[PDB]
Amino acid sequence: HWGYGKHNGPEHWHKDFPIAKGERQSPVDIDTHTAKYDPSLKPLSVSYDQATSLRILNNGHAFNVEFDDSQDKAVLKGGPLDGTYRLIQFHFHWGSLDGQGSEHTVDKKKYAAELHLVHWNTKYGDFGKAVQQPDGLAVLGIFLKVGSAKPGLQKVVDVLDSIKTKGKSADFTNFDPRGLLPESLDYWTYPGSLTTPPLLECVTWIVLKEPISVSSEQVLKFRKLNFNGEGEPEELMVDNWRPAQPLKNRQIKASFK
Ligand SMILES: NS(=O)(=O)c1ccc(CCO)cc1
Ligand SMILES: NS(=O)(=O)c1ccc(CCO)cc1
């Protein structure tokens, strides 16, 4: 029953998910001047060449592109991570207008959208067991700004008409998530949480410094999706982002000088 509206949005989540007021919540504002370069971070490795995308699903909050995670086909390692983290899905958060939409902010700047590539630590065997661990997940976050079109996003854009409403899915095989990355893998990292209920504090966040550029037309198509199911009153799927949460006793580390 949670959502993003006045009556079920982020200010209400704590009543059913009390960890919403926890010590390690996400997203956060990334104060770039306070974030410190960390020489102990190892090189980050995004290894997506063998990824197997399967399906795209409108879940009533966002849309998820799902992957086969039954083997180490698309993994994230290095950087702040101990071991191997396997890609399970990606999704986005976006705004009703280009001036808002991201979850993380950079010196208070909100981007038009934010991509989350979600991975689980293979030492825990399955995603469900990983979300019972303080180092169970790694989410690679990538900001979207509006400018030139992102070619590797267009296949996603053009399938959205077929998953307009909650509960709809479509085949989405042979999609290469490498087409959603920027050139640089410079990043900030900190320990946090899922940004939607159940808000579990399991995530090592890795937020890339370089945004990707997408066209106005691409993001406008995100905004034509619906939160509601077929046959129900239409509510545009926009502003599906949680605002920045208190940093508490955390430090954000930078991979770059
Ligand atoms: N705490 S919550 O966001 O899951 C929630 C908000 C609001 C309602 C009642 C309105 O549908 C129920 C649950
Ligand atoms: N809809 S989803 O992205 O939460 C999801 C993706 C992939 C799987 C399969 C995991 O073995 C399950 C759920």
Ligand SMILES: NS(=O)(=O)c1ccc(CCO)cc1
């Ligand atoms: N970091 S900044 O000063 O470019 C900036 C601050 C505040 C905002 C408003 C929210 O996006 C945008 C940019």
Ligand SMILES: NS(=O)(=O)c1ccc(CCO)cc1
């Ligand atoms: N937005 S997020 O990447 O923190 C996130 C990833 C995964 C889940 C689990 C349900 O899909 C919830 C939130």
Ligand SMILES: [Zn+2]
């Ligand atoms: Zn997310």
